[model samples]
Target chain A: MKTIEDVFIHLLSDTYSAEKQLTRALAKLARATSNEKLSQAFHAHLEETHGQIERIDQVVESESNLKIKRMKCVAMEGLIEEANEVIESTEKNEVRDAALIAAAQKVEHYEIASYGTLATLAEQLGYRKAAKLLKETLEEEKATDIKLTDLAINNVNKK
Target chain B: KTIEDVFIHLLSDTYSAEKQLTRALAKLARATSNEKLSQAFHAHLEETHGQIERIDQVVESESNLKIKRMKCVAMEGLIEEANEVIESTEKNEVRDAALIAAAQKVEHYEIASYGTLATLAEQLGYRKAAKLLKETLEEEKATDIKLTDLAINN
Candidate 1:
């Protein structure tokens, strides 16, 4: 039976799988970018993605009464497919870096939206600690998105 | 296909997503109890119709390719999830917040799609198409901001 709590847990698991997939994907994105700063940003976020997954685990454990398992995030898979195509299709370094930033922002925005909902749902369920953790990661995702925009406008796209 | 082909393809994908979203938003507006959220959905439903027309213009300007609807799987997942939220027997406050969260996800998806399309358009020298896409991009961002405000303040 799929209760609201079950749906919330599934949502967390979906994001967990998405973040785990992102770690490997970000590595390729980091390698694809020619810009030093953008590459470093991707590398740094790879580590943050790992941390975000840990946060998801903690949230799941906090709500231990529920059984949650990772679900496939088909949307992230599609986003990564688009990113890979962009990376492969572009030969120009500037265009490649700009495309990478755009792809990275999409991933970030997905996490931002997912975590925002997860946090609110957590709070609604009275899981205060889990809500706090999700909100922290949401803020981090938003910051990463801003950094990507800065890299695109002031650096990659300008070149 | 090169950048131009890819741009057209992405544009078609977004057009499909936007068309699907208009019907979803109309349903959400009727389902939501929050007056402001309902109004926002209604307004965006209209914008979505206009956005589809703009996309049609962009597709028409490109040679040989015509407007076609492709399955936007991501938006399908998003709308399905949102529909679940609305269908559940959640409290008014929780449901309102959840609805905002779902709408923001849809906005962010469009922002990403349009952002990528505009960048590709600029790269391929489709300056006018890029400008129109950027306009839509800004509008999506604005809608996202409005949803965030509603989530926090209301």
Candidate 2:
């Protein structure tokens, strides 16, 4: 019978691929947004995303785990496609920023949910250090989401 | 200018995503080794049906933007990944756990979409649209919460 640790490895590799995809996606989103704070936030998250990736790498190295295949994160592929479509559809207006906010927040929420799962699985699988590291990214993602919401309420919504 | 046009387009896209999910959930229901997980997937399929109806309500009340289902690549890729998980792994608790992660990712997408759509409606002052979208958003959130509980226990 397969174990939780097997699932954890799959998810860890899945998320590692997911964040790598987001690096490109976030940069595209960062450049697409007209709002400075929004772009800045995307750039900041983009940077933190790298740090998260490094954390994952560290976890892999820390464990006696085998090589990660770096599975493709198909959901993120679609997410970025959706994000790209939003840019193509909207004009350079606050409405575009509004759409961008929704798009990136969708990405953020997805990451937050999956990361929470990874962190939980890490702790359960006896990888306590990895759990703490993954937990660090989780809180950071949650804060990024709230910051986006703050931006939305303050400025992005316009006709 | 179409003030609520973006929101309508967003709603239509999610309608298509939910439709696609109907098929995915059934497949998941069959693939899952755990009885409880299968039941949850089956239940979610029915819940998603109503969520689709909710989409119809929001679209009809919001604007005259002709509602044709939009191509949602995100949901497509998300489901594709789920299929991969099912195929790549053996059928067991591990696969069930993986399935929950995939399912939760899908739910998270809808949560974000519905949340943003509701916010757009509220901001655009479409009171009825806001109410309907918010209702669906909460439903999606509740599903994710349930999936979270299953993730650990199973």
Model 1 stretches with alpha carbons more than 4 Å out? A156-159, B1-73, B76-154
Most lDDT-accurate candidate: 2
TM-score of chain A of each: 0.94, 0.93
Q: Write the per-residue lDDT of candidate 1 for residues A61-130, one digit (tens) a residue.
A: 8766755574667678657765776777745677777777877777776677677767776777688899
True C-alpha contacts between chains kept, each model in order: 0.06, 0.20
Off by over 4 Å in 2: A156-159, B1-20, B23-154
Q: Which 10 consecutive residues of model 2 chain A have the lowest summed lDDT?
A: A1-10
Evaluate all candidate structures by whole-model CA lDDT and list the values in order: 0.77, 0.79
TM-score for each model: 0.54, 0.54
